[PDB]
Amino acid sequence: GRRTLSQRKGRGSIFKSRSHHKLGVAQHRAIDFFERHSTVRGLVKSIEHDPGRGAPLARVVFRNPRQYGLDKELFICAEGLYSGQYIYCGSKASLHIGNVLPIGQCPEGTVVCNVESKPGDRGIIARASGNYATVISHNADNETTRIRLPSGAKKTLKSNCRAMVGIIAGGGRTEKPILKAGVAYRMYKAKRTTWPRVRGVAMNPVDHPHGGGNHQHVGHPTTLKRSSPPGQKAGKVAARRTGLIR
RNA sequence: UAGAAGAAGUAAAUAUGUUAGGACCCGAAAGAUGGUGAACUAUACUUGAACGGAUUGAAGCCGAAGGAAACUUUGGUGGAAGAUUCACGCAGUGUUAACGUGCAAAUUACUUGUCAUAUUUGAGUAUAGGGGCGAAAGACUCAUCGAACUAUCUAGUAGCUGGUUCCACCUGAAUAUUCCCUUAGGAAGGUCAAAGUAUUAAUAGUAUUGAUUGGUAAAGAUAAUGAUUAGGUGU
RNA sequence: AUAAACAUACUUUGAAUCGGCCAAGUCUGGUAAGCAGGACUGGCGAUGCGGGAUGAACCGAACGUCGAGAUAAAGUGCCAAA
RNA sequence: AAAAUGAAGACAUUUUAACGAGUAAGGAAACGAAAUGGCGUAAGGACAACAAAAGUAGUAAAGAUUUAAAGUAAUUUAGAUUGAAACUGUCCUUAGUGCAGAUCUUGGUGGUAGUAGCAAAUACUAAGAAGAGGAAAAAAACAUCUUAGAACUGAAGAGGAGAAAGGUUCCUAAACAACAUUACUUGGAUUAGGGUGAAUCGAUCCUAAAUUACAGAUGGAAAUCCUUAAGAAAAGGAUUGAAAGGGAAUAAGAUUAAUAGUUCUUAAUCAAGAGAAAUGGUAACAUAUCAUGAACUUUAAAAUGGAGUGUGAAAAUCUACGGAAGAGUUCUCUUUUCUUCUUAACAAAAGUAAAUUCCACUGAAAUGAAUCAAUCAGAGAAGUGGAAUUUAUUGGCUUUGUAAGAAAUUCAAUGAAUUGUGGUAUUUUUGCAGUCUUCAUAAAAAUUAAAGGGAAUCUUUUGCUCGUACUAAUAACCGCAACAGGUCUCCAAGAAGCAAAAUCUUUAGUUAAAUAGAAUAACGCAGGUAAGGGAAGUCGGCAACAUAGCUCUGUAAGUUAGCAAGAAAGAGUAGCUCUGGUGAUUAUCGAAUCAGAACUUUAAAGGUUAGGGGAAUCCGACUGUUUAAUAAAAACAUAGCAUUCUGAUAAAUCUAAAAGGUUCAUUACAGAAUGUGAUUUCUGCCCAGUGCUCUGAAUGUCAAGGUAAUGAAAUUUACUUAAGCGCGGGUUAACGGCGGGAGUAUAUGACUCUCUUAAGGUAGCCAAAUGCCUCGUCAUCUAAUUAGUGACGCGCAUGAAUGGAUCACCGUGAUUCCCACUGUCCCUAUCUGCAAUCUAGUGAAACCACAGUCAAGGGAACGGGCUUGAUUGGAACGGCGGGGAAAGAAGACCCUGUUGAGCUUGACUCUAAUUUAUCAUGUGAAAUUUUCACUCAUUUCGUUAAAUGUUAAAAAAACAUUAAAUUGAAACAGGCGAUUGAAAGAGAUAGACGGGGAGUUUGGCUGGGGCGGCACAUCUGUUACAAGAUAACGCAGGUGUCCAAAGAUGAACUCAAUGAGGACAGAAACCUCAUGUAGAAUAUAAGGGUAUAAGUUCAUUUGAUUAUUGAUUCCAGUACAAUCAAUAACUCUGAAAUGAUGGCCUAACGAUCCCUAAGAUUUUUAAUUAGAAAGAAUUUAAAACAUAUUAGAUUUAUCUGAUGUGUGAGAAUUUCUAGUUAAUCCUUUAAUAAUAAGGCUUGGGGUGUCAGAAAAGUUACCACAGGGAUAACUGGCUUGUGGCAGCCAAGCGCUCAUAGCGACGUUGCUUUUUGAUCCUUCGAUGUCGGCUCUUCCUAUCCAUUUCAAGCAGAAUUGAAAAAAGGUAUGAUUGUUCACCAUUUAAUAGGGAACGUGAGCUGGGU
RNA sequence: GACCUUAAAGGUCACCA
């Protein structure tokens, strides 16, 4: 046989990210004393559209708590932010939309976004459009707090992990139905090469495990073990269930 | 059942036979190893270039009239759409036209379709052979692709096909038998040739006389086993 | 009884060969076959010559180069010798 | 062969006799009576004038051409001519030693053949010049240049220029041997010269996608990774990457045979250099340098998509008024028609614009302002007055300097003349303004300026390196070339029109671009027309005809309500003369557009351009893509729908490895893996099987390890270990699946019974692109329907995200029917151009054993050659497609190879990735090794390693720095800050999983292969032919066993059946007598054998045993197996002779290696006792240390010297008899021991393909070596079957066997069906039907002539002569065939390689 | 027709040309 399309994706030749017009890395600012024990105030200069992602980006400008100059940051917009707004980052920040607070200071039930899975790693969870994470409970014995991830899973993080209060802007993006093949083509302008997807049953036995015979069909069960080698791992992987959900 | 029984062997040059090597000469599709290719084509990115004329008329907006209201009727304006068409171009539906030792190792003529957003296109750049790339035809990867090109292993192997070079003279065949992964082929054996011997209980594809063997042709059918048409006599 | 001394008995080494085919006062399967397969012998293969007009197998007869005669199968109206 | 002779003769002796064919094959050399005889090629060693100049040769070698001679032949010899320097004969030796073939290799050359051709791109003609090169009885044509005529490209060009590529092709002169399919005086061709000028155009500079270094990391290696992260490297990050991106600065005229934003004249610009620090304006803001402005920081520019509308300006075109100069027309007119009337870079500022944004005064409602559209206003409209920016350089346009001195148009013979002003017109270019659109937001750096801050106190010089010629294509580039193919751009006139369309023309370019002339045949290619009919042609309206612009009227069903729709359908349209509407400015001026009216004619879109329309069915929703070179589609994509996994140190996944890489500059509205394919309606039941999974169970099965026991030890044994499987549950929008039979209300069967699945196919749909039967049944379409449509449904074998049903719009998709139109057709005629024909010049190729008249025969079963006939005159031109089983190609179909390759799978054997367990020693603790606590290796991260730890002390989009006065601005820790953490990663070993991947295999026989069978090891009878052998996928059957008795022996008895008797008792129970040759039994298939037995019964027993020989059956006289004959033991039975080494006989079975059992003690040795008999033993140089005894040292398992003796020494040993002890089948190679292992002999474990590999498929994507050893087609033999014909006569025919038929039987012919065979063809004979056309047969359908009848006439029926002439048109189907509707005198049947493909078609296959 | 099964009846095969 040949090497299937999923195998050719891992080499990254034509499947490299189309990130040329992107604004940059969107994250919190690097942790320091002034964020651990004080608050630094930033100014939302503008709100910009980052190619390839559905949420807007804010060009915040903190000043320089230790030197002279400007610290041009690049945050992910929370819904409701506006140009010229002031936002405060630090442990003593007020509980307002757009402010950055350690996850331990947020009252149980607070909605946050752009949460750090580890202290000081500048944002991991709840970064897509309209997404958010909820603080479940605190644990002052070992300085851990429980949050509910947007997928529904519960995760325990350190109580000093930072997060931004609010909802990532641009929600309800995927509810608008794409209508045309051309529109879907334009969606991957600043993404990887994946769109026009040929069914495995339409390929040939050399190309794909599904490449069939005189009738377009699979032939063998499409639920496979997690341990299948790359090359035959095509279809549902480690499927605990199948069929329409009730 | 090997041996001994007053030793025969050895050396070298040829000829013939067996055997290994390119192996009488030429012939595979294949396999492995190392390199060269994206000047053709495939996809993707960077930076450039290229929409002229018509058709239809969506939101949005304005007037008039009707209405308690909700709003409706009517006339305009507007210029959307992977909307309809023509042109520069492009493709290749049909003639299964031309040509078919061509203009051309895929072109020409008319007809047909298409002719800016999933568009067309230049340069740069990236992806390499059990790999790439593929809106998927096993398609494309320099006229080479159901695994490119190039060189080495390599004069690859062939029970299969083709060829195999002077004269006279003498002798002159085979298709049984056994075994084989055997059936287009081999070894044992038969037929044949050439060398070399032995005075030789070592002649016969013949007939006769004598003693035998066998169960074929024929013959038989209340002679045994069967098959089958009738007629008398007795109970 | 007849024949047999270039009789007889061989020994060694080795070549090619084991695709066969035909005839019949023969046989088996088949309706049958210029079909398929066998017993015995003679042939073609390996083979020309004379005759059957022509023909791998039929009939006579097998071959160094020639001359003369008697012949064989078979023929004798012309082609064609009688 | 035998005799005779035999040192040398010679002819390989003399004589006599017999013999002589031959494919494959053999006979090497030498051998005197020669164990075959010789010829030739080349080289090596000798010999070649015997008397001291010793083979031939310039008095002509080798070679070549021939003429003759010798030899059976291979070959040799000699002469003649040519040739001019080496060569030959004999003997041995040696070998790169003899050619007709290999689709042989290389080179050369023929026929074809003066043949096919030298035919796209409209086109040339006259006069003259130059030249050898238009002559001549028309030799009808003539290359280059100039002039004139006539033309084409038609300004998206056949024009003027660039990028790439080419590389001197550029310009000129001389010259034409070759080349540009004739020629050339021409040339992009030959020869020789000349030619490319930059401070301003580019490269150079910057960075994009990307690329590459030192050090570092990885690797066995080559090398790979990393690109600023790891670095004592680089205020911050290295190299390269654009002649289309960014970018300091030049223009006009003139000049050269050719270079020019490059030279010259004139006129400019740019960069680098040289000679307590300003005013004005209310404000927006403004001032020939002015008017200081460091570090540091920020902002902006360079630098940002597309569409569409409006509009400013310039240019081009057109036009209004006024002219000046020149040109054209002019016997008909034309105050006429045409040309010229221009201006740069850089700067200036008389005059004067459009649009946008801001500033000041004021404060809008009765709301206003404005655009084509919009849009805006108390965070302030409108108004008035101002400021700024943009508009191809200063400042947009006119104007000005440059500058008229240039340039253009004229005139004179260098010198003179002129060079106004406009437009509410079109196009192009370039800006501007707002509007729309994106799940698309549409680059960076070099480089420049400004600001915040307040540190410090005009002239002139120079401008380097490299490119610069030319083409840029119907001749300079890539395709072998001057190739009708391909290749990126800039500039762009008139007519007409909606139009950059078609058509014609101006400026420019060219008239040649693979040759022409004559004639005007066939057959063609390209373009046409056609009476009457109108698809009747055909697989099919293929091809062609037909519709075609604009205006007005009108427009259906269906529908996703958007469409259908340009639906369909109808009318108008010309020319000329007029009339009216639509404005600007304030009476004058201007625009093409619309409407209307008289009149005339050839009655009007049509020169060119320019939709045929309608009714339905299927598939796909749509726009899109696709097999470059036979498939453009129903296939792929698509939006929509659905499922699975993943919290990122993850999922997927590349890599040998890696602080390695991709999605990821990412974070579940995300990433990755799949199925279905818009919308509507709906997705039924099944978890048994195979997958997937579980948050699940332990003590079923499971490895290396770990622990323990025995033993001298290896070894062995036991216990305990993870995943995996098993056990239990879940899951089908996971792979997939979704039944039978019988009664029952003139038929059907609601109903009932019964069998048993995991579930029994549900809603739907249907002879469907899915239905064999089948051309299903009923309607409809037609005259006629294997076609279409609508219905029916026990549906071979429909059916629900393998998606079911439904269709609106859409489609170079498949199918049917109507209208219109027509040469598709009846049925062909005719016209034009280019060829073909002939000629001058020029000039190939495929192919070719030799060749070329027929019939029949035979033959390899279809001859051009052979045999017998028919017949023949030599050379051929134009056509032609019958033949040459014509050419092209080692058949691609089929088969065979112990030949492959792609693909698939629990085929066999493995393997990367995944996974589980153990080992690989961080500290300090607890529980029964586990659980904890820590960090210290380790992992994953973050930053400018920027306040770690412990003490101490949401009103405002603005600024924040270089400090004033060691502090100000606190100290210390041996932790840059977090995170994980002794667990996880990488290594080793072990178990599981693993078509993701690698290697390989897939028996044989065979009336072709496959399916079927086993004729493959094997027995009986028969074919089988009276010895032995012996065929078929011949016939009838049989084996892979069974038996402690069914082996051995002894004894007794006689069986099957029948008759006659005997209570129940009978046809069959048990008893008796008689007859009883086996008709019973003997394990089994069949055939043999058997009567005081080989059968039945009784009794004893284990010979169904050990060892050794010799034979017989298959046989190769191998093995296995079997069948016998003896011998030596120990036994069984019998009184005994005998019998017994399995079964009454013919089948009942098995190598090498490997595993596993049994046996090798009968005998031979050593030592020591007692007895006896023979026995001299070889001869000088010495160290191992067993040690004692001393001289030193030492404490530890204590060693280190030297003195010393024996050892170890040499001037007994064997045999034998009787004991005793011990050992005893051989070996593990220095000697022994107990374990272990290996030998030797004999059995068992098995190969059934049975003389014995370890082995699944599919190729319609296929490949190679071959095959007529072998199938699919013709032909040939046969004729079962198909067709036709006879003989007899039981009967039918109202009576009557034979008018006409003829049963039960029986004899033939034919090759028009299909069989049966495999003879020819596998380095190829083109395989169905139809169309066209010719011929042949008669077994005759019609016409002609006759006979018969159950023939009155008519219509008919049977038969004879006769094959000269006729034998049709359509619907459906690819059909042959068939079935319908017609018509006719009849609408007969057949052959010719199932006639006919260099004759067509391509419907089917 | 061939193979299989039941108490005649069914079931699978019938292929490359």
UniProtKB/Swiss-Prot annotation:
The keyword Cytoplasm applies. Its main location: cytoplasm. SMART domains: Ribosomal_L2, Ribosomal_L2_C. PROSITE patterns: RIBOSOMAL_L2 (PS00467). One of its GO terms (cellular component) is cytosolic large ribosomal subunit. GO terms for molecular function: RNA binding; structural constituent of ribosome. Transmembrane segments: none annotated. Keywords: Cytoplasm, Ribonucleoprotein, Ribosomal protein. Residues 206-246 are annotated as: Disordered. It is found in: Cytoplasm. GO terms for biological process: cytoplasmic translation. Pfam families: Ribosomal_L2, Ribosomal_L2_C. Belongs to the universal ribosomal protein uL2 family. Component of the large ribosomal subunit. The ribosome is a large ribonucleoprotein complex responsible for the synthesis of proteins in the cell. Component of the large ribosomal subunit. This is Large ribosomal subunit protein uL2. The gene is RPL8.
